[PDB]
Amino acid sequence: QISVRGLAGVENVTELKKNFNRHLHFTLVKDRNVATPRDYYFALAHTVRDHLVGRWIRTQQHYYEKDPKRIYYLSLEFYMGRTLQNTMVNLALENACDEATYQLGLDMEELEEIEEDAGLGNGGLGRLAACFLDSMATLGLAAYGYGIRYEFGIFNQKICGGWQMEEADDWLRYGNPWEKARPEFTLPVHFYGRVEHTSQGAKWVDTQVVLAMPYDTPVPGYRNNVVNTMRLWSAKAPNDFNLGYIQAVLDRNLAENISRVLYPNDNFFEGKELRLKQEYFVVAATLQDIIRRFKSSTNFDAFPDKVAIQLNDTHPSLAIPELMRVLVDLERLDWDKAWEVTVKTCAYTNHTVLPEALERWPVHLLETLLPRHLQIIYEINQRFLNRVAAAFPGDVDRLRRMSLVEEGAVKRINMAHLCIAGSHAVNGVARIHSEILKKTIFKDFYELEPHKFQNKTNGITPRRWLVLCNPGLAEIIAERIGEEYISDLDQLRKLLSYVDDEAFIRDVAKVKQENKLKFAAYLEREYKVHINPNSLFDVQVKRIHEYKRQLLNCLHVITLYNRIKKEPNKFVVPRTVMIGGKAAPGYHMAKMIIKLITAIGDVVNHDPVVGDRLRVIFLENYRVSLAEKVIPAADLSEQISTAGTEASGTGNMKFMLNGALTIGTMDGANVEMAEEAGEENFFIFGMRVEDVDRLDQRGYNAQEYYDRIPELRQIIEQLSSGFFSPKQPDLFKDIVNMLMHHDRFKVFADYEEYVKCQERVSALYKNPREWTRMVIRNIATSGKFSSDRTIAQYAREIWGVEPSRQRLPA
Amino acid sequence: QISVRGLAGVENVTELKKNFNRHLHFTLVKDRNVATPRDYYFALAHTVRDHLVGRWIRTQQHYYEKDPKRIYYLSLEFYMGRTLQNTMVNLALENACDEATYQLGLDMEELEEIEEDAGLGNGGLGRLAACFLDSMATLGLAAYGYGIRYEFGIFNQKICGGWQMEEADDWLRYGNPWEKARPEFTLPVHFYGRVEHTSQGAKWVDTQVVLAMPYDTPVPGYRNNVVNTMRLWSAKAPNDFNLGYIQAVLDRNLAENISRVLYPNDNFFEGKELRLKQEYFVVAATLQDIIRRFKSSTNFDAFPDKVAIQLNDTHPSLAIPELMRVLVDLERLDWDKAWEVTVKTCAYTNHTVLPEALERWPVHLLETLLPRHLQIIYEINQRFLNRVAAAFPGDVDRLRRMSLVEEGAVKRINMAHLCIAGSHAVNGVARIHSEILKKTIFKDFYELEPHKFQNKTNGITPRRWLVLCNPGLAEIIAERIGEEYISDLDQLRKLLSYVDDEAFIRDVAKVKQENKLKFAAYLEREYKVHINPNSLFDVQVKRIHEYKRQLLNCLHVITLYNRIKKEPNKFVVPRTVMIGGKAAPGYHMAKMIIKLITAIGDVVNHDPVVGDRLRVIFLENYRVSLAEKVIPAADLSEQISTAGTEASGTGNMKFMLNGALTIGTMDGANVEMAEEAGEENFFIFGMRVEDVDRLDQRGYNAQEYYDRIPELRQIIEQLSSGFFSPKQPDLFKDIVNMLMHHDRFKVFADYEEYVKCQERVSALYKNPREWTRMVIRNIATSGKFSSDRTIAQYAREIWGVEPSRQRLPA
Ligand SMILES: O=c1ccn([C@@H]2O[C@H](CO)[C@@H](O)[C@H](O)[C@H]2O)c(=O)[nH]1
Ligand SMILES: O=c1ccn([C@@H]2O[C@H](CO)[C@@H](O)[C@H](O)[C@H]2O)c(=O)[nH]1
Numbered sequence A, B: 001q002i003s004v005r006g007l008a009g010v011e012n013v014t015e016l017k018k019n020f021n022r023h024l025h026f027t028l029v030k031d032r033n034v035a036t037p038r039d040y041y042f043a044l045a046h047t048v049r050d051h052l053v054g055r056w057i058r059t060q061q062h063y064y065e066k067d068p069k070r071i072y073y074l075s076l077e078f079y080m081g082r083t084l085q086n087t088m089v090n091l092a093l094e095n096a097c098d099e100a101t102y103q104l105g106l107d108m109e110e111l112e113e114i115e116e117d118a119g120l121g122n123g124g125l126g127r128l129a130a131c132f133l134d135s136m137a138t139l140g141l142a143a144y145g146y147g148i149r150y151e152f153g154i155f156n157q158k159i160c161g162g163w164q165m166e167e168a169d170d171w172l173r174y175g176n177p178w179e180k181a182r183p184e185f186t187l188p189v190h191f192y193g194r195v196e197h198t199s200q201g202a203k204w205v206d207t208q209v210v211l212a213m214p215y216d217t218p219v220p221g222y223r224n225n226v227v228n229t230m231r232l233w234s235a236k237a238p239n240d241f242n243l244g245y246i247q248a249v250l251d252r253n254l255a256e257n258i259s260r261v262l263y264p265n266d267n268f269f270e271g272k273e274l275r276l277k278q279e280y281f282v283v284a285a286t287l288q289d290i291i292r293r294f295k296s297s298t299n300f301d302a303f304p305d306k307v308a309i310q311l312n313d314t315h316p317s318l319a320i321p322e323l324m325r326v327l328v329d330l331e332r333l334d335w336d337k338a339w340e341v342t343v344k345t346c347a348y349t350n351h352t353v354l355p356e357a358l359e360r361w362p363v364h365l366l367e368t369l370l371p372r373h374l375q376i377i378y379e380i381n382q383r384f385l386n387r388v389a390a391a392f393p394g395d396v397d398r399l400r401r402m403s404l405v406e407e408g409a410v411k412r413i414n415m416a417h418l419c420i421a422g423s424h425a426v427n428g429v430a431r432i433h434s435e436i437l438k439k440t441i442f443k444d445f446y447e448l449e450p451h452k453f454q455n456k457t458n459g460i461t462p463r464r465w466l467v468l469c470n471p472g473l474a475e476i477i478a479e480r481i482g483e484e485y486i487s488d489l490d491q492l493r494k495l496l497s498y499v500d501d502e503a504f505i506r507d508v509a510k511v512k513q514e515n516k517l518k519f520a521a522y523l524e525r526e527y528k529v530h531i532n533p534n535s536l537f538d539v540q541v542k543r544i545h546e547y548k549r550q551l552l553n554c555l556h557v558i559t560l561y562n563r564i565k566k567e568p569n570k571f572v573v574p575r576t577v578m579i580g581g582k583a584a585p586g587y588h589m590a591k592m593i594i595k596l597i598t599a600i601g602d603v604v605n606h607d608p609v610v611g612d613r614l615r616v617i618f619l620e621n622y623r624v625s626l627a628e629k630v631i632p633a634a635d636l637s638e639q640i641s642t643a644g645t646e647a648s649g650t651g652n653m654k655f656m657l658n659g660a661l662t663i664g665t666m667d668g669a670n671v672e673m674a675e676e677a678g679e680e681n682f683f684i685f686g687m688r689v690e691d692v693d694r695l696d697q698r699g700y701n702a703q704e705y706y707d708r709i710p711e712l713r714q715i716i717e718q719l720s721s722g723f724f725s726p727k728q729p730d731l732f733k734d735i736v737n738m739l740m741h742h743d744r745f746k747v748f749a750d751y752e753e754y755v756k757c758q759e760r761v762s763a764l765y766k767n768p769r770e771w772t773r774m775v776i777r778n779i780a781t782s783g784k785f786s787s788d789r790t791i792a793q794y795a796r797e798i799w800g801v802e803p804s805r806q807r808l809p810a
Helices: A013-028 A038-066 A084-091 A095-104 A109-114 A126-139 A245-250 A252-259 A275-293 A298-308 A320-330 A335-345 A362-368 A371-391 A395-400 A413-422 A431-439 A444-450 A463-468 A472-481 A487-499 A503-529 A551-567 A588-604 A624-633 A651-657 A670-677 A689-698 A702-708 A712-722 A732-740 A747-765 A768-780 A787-799 B011-027 B036-068 B086-090 B094-103 B108-112 B124-138 B244-250 B252-259 B273-295 B300-306 B318-331 B335-345 B363-369 B371-391 B396-402 B415-421 B429-438 B443-448 B462-469 B472-480 B487-497 B501-529 B551-568 B588-602 B624-633 B651-657 B668-676 B690-698 B702-708 B710-722 B733-741 B747-765 B766-778 B787-799
Strands: A070-074 A077-083 A118-120 A144-149 A158-160 A162-169 A187-191 A194-198 A201-205 A208-220 A227-236 A307-312 A344-348 A360-362 A412-413 A425-428 A453-455 A536-543 A577-578 A614-619 A636-639 A662-663 B071-075 B080-082 B118-120 B143-148 B156-160 B161-167 B187-191 B196-199 B200-206 B207-219 B229-238 B307-312 B344-347 B360-362 B413-414 B423-428 B453-455 B536-541 B575-580 B614-619 B636-639 B659-664
Touching: A013 A038, A013 A095, A013 B036, A038 A084, A038 A095, A038 A109, A038 A208, A038 A227, A038 B011, A070 A126, A070 A275, A077 A126, A077 A624, A084 A095, A084 A208, A084 A463, A084 B363, A095 A109, A126 A144, A126 A208, A126 A227, A126 A307, A126 A463, A126 A787, A144 A275, A144 B200, A162 A588, A187 A275, A194 A371, A201 A320, A201 A371, A208 A252, A208 A275, A227 A252, A227 A275, A227 B273, A245 A252, A252 A275, A252 B252, A275 A307, A275 A320, A275 A362, A307 A320, A307 A335, A307 A787, A320 A335, A320 A344, A320 A371, A320 A413, A320 A689, A335 A344, A344 A413, A344 B413, A360 A362, A362 A371, A362 A412, A371 A395, A371 A413, A371 A444, A395 A444, A412 A413, A431 A444, A431 A453, A431 A670, A463 A472, A463 A624, A463 A651, A472 A487, A472 A503, A487 A768, A487 A787, A503 A624, A503 A768, A503 B588, A536 A624, A536 A747, A551 A577, A551 A588, A551 A614, A551 A712, A551 A747, A551 B156, A577 A624, A588 A732, A636 A651, A636 B690, A651 A662, A651 A670, A651 A768, A651 B702, A662 A768, A689 B588, A702 A712, A702 A732, A702 A747, A712 A732, A747 A768, A747 B143, A787 B187, B011 B036, B011 B094, B036 B086, B036 B094, B036 B207, B036 B229, B071 B124, B071 B273, B080 B124, B080 B624, B086 B094, B086 B108, B086 B207, B086 B462, B094 B108, B108 B161, B118 B335, B124 B143, B124 B207, B124 B229, B124 B307, B124 B462, B124 B787, B143 B273, B156 B551, B161 B588, B187 B273, B196 B371, B200 B318, B207 B252, B207 B273, B207 B702, B229 B252, B229 B273, B244 B252, B252 B273, B273 B307, B273 B363, B300 B307, B300 B335, B307 B318, B307 B335, B307 B787, B318 B335, B318 B344, B318 B371, B318 B415, B335 B344, B344 B415, B360 B363, B363 B371, B363 B413, B363 B501, B371 B396, B371 B415, B371 B443, B396 B443, B423 B429, B423 B787, B429 B443, B429 B453, B429 B668, B462 B472, B462 B624, B472 B487, B472 B501, B487 B766, B487 B787, B501 B624, B501 B766, B536 B624, B536 B747, B551 B575, B551 B614, B551 B710, B551 B747, B575 B624, B588 B614, B588 B733, B636 B651, B651 B659, B651 B668, B651 B766, B659 B668, B659 B747, B659 B766, B702 B710, B702 B733, B702 B747, B710 B733, B710 B747, B747 B766
Parallel strands: A070 A144, A070 A307, A144 A227, A307 A344, A344 A425, A425 A453, A536 A577, A536 A636, A577 A614, A636 A662, B071 B143, B071 B307, B143 B229, B307 B344, B344 B423, B423 B453, B536 B575, B536 B636, B575 B614, B636 B659
Antiparallel strands: A077 A118, A158 A162, A187 A208, A194 A201, A208 A227, A360 A412, B080 B118, B156 B161, B187 B207, B196 B200, B207 B229, B360 B413
């Protein structure tokens, strides 16, 4: 049908059809008379999988022969989504499979919808890891993703009575055709025990053993025949475990619970023992695997030349003392040499400056669970603080500020401080964020070792986030400038010479309209909700958090409703306001925000005076597969975090690439986005970081805004009196109290400028031609935000390896 | 190599080789340079599996078209062993695969040894179910095996310091290529709750739900292209289960524990709640599946014409009140009609008369777990006792004896009484056993309904138990009388005309010697134990139980040792005494018996005066795969249970078929075996059932034997004084005390006759030619003990269906 989806040539189509029928028969043990759509999905998945393995085996043998430096990306989250379409796109099989299935009498899009998301992440940090794996394979790097194979990923969100309900994400119920279990490469992981000092060093003894069994998933590069590996560990009890009899067997569950479920906290640290076990489990198993592979190439001087370990946040921070443990206790290297190797091997990426999100583990937990590691951490700290003391003599407060050990009621280890001390590179994820790190929370460390601190602005993969989710747009772009932009997104700049092209303007606006119609149809079919496809699609999708200010969006929605009710017969640009995202099960305020959004919808959507001019919909169960649907459909992207709180954002980049305009604060990557497109082509509003600082020094008084803004006062009075909850009048008292008395994120302070800016958006939407021209200027300048650019920078500036676009033999 | 293993013809060998390489590459994701023997096993297993599926799909579609009466064999145990060789034998693929692997540079026997046993059973009852499935498929019956897919089967037995140690049988660690998960056919099972009475009947409400997910395993018939199904249920928690958050997800384990582990009790009832849940789980899921399949052929009058349910012991006895529940509560049939259908559908097989083995469930357990079923059981009992009262007016003690409800400290339900009341047929498993049932424990029931009581003498499959485990013997037999005996074992009678054939005598003795050499080599390679292959191989392999009298065997061994030590320079027929079998983890006496056996070995095997004349070896980890090795190697089969205790035995039949002579009591199937071969050709000794009864009436006094038999006195004095345990002199005090004061099984009473009989065995072994001629007379008359005969009798006399040897189209 379309050119970007590859060739459907006779030979391939015939061969795909026969392999489909073979899998249906031999693999699924079904015939055409009893097969369901799910059986057909699996037959297709197995057929596409076959095409991977040949390339998978030869990529890994290529790395063995050439022995390049290996990159190990350690993460507790890999937010992968669906794999089928991504695999077809990267292998140039999409049109052939589309033809093959059509000839078998099947609709491939229907089959694609049967696949479960691999929801092994919470949001931005987890999705970044997935985009990174794609880019590393596309750039021909010898890279491995290492994590945990959670039996249950992020919970499925149901909305009941306007409230969030959680249910288990049993994503493995029907099997996972993409993974290959590798029980032969099972490795032991140790917990608890005690430290014994002998004549020849320390020994960690009397430990409890949990086995780590790896499952490998292929990661295909974009049309380069490279297939890398994501290896995820699963926890297994040893066979002599607790070995009355029946109980001992049932107790195996305790060990295997380590890999059972993903902790659903986003930007919030929960100091639970099971989480700590997960963190060590991934680290201990991964490092043994790394060292094994290194020895199979004695002398650890070459270790940093052959190995890079990237820590995704502090979650795998125990890699630092674990590497020290192995080098010192097991390989018998002296401390100083081991430390040199460790530092040159490890690099750390920070993803947030929110204090409640920083990992600070109680010493008493580490003492019991990992007694040798605590000893190593203390020694690291002592030696590090001796360096600080020598650099800044007599600065006693600096010593306490920089210590890895935090004193107080309970002593804690600051894992971020551990990561900086033990890494040769520390990076933030957007220019403003990296500057904030150097100026505020890691200022002391920057002053000691300025060379360590870098920026690596985040990106997204244009494969999943353009070609896959928006084939209509990818096609009209390819018609003008060719296909090379898919692996060289900077080429999109060539589209600036089409900004006054009447044909292109019409096509861009046409693709958006089609996307909006398709998404409007999805909402009817799957959720029985009705929307006007002619309205402005105003969307905010991301995890529910106070810093992200879904509440500010809510206030605007209510302002629009109140203005309509005041002047009903006055014309307003029709809007469909869509808000979606999950709240952590124990985050009360976030759960209340979801209830507020649905409650506003219940009033607004059923007011006869409003008509089809304003609709408020809560998008249930937001996840990767849903993002691929709503993002191509959006007109307006809401990126309205309080300045200085969103480290980067990546959802922002997805919207820009897909033809939505952005309303946003000068926060995270929004700054660089506006810089690339031009500020005239972005809807920037609100306080800058400097303005937030000024307000904090003076003291934030929300009552001031309430007193001086009558439209804001009305909303607060409506919320308090029970306008949006007539049966439970005080339902939202907690929300009002927070807004009025303890709002960390200064919702009221940005309200006026936000509403004003939204008026300017509505004004531009009234002029379809000029709206679209601004859109083209956004898409054309979105090149910098490809994760291929990001990964190229990591490769050159941190890992010390060169990317390659050269094909491997097929 | 040998004719019975099929054709290895060019076309097939080439096609097997290419499919092997395809699986190694695409299925296992390996190349020849990294592949291990295990990878090669799996590639072969997948290759052979492919040949099953075509026949599997067409068998099941054949049953749909023809709509025959279906046979449902319900069992908590299916002791399957290994599947690869059995599949090759039944599909006539053994020689072709042997050739194909040889040409790939692989040894197939080495590959076969990598497969884990499917150890989903304890012993005889579990193995019977497996032989039965094989015979039902071979006889073309529309039969289904239904059970539980235990994550852990019977424990692996390690011997440490002479003591049994248990370890988890993690049989699924590397995967199971034979099974196919069927998550689409998942069914709900209900537990707990309460009973609600409405205007329109009873309702079972507020229940906890556990999901039952089926896994299907193919069961191939012997060269008839029939492939039946064994469906095993796995427990799964529902997704809203307990749905703080993390705990709710981890608590899913509680529901899924239902299918976690096989209870390791053999001939002993343990009234544990988890066991009861397992029993209902299998029954509830199975019956829904049965009814679904029946409706997809409204009127339940035809139900017994289209369905037979065979209960393997009382373990699935809840099928009776569950069928009533479904028919009465859900289908709204009147009681009397539902009862007629239930009785005509169900049949019950009893496997033991030992009182401690009978299932008697506490009413309070059933009240809480299955409140509706208890109500139905009470109603069944009331109506049944009204029939008894009408047949035997005024016989009040009969009423209490026959009641399904047993009064006492705790009220219990007698599950055996439930089974008789609710079944149209009740059978024992050997002629003597079935007679004992009618004369003793079920006398009252036999008097009420004589027509219900039948005998079905047990059998073994000659596929696994001759062709597979003893190809050498199968070949020499085939040379003379052809191949038809494999599915018509009665043809072995034709071998009687070769009893004076000098060529045949030499060949029979040659096959045995080769088997003994091969097994002697296995013991060195895998356990580093040394044995004399020229000695008489005296073997007792079976679960360790007091009734089986491994202790009587021990006493003989010690008698032989004492006689040698008394007259060292006197000639004795050299023996290798081998004893193996597992003890239930909480069966103290059985564990002590294992320790005694190893302790005797420690003294006997290292006495320089004994030399190579006497060896005592404990066979570690006895299981199906080990049985296939030791049985073809045996000269003497020990079947020495106290008369009236071994319902049938099946190990006895395996030895007879494989060229061992039998020393045994007139118990179980030994009686029919001796009848078939002639008593002159069996070594029968000891009390008959009548003699045991006489001794019980008089009172068994063990001291009498101790006082009058000096050789027995010496042994007891040796045991007591610490001769066999010098460091722990009183180690065996419990054994001695039991033997002297509370021996339920009268070990001493059979000692004299046993030792005398053993002398006659040794005498015959001195004459190789006459030993072998007696062997030929045994093998030649073993025909009756094919499970094909047994299943034919079930089919004709209980299920009301005709067996068929006709091939299905390939
Ligand atoms: O716990 C956390 C901490 C940070 N981030 C996000 O990481 C993304 C990738 O770097 C950033 O784009 C985003 O600003 C940040 O909140 C998370 O998603 N979870
Ligand atoms: O709990 C039990 C009860 C009986 N049997 C055995 O069943 C076999 C098959 O019918 C018989 O051959 C054997 O005599 C009996 O002990 C068991 O193996 N377990």
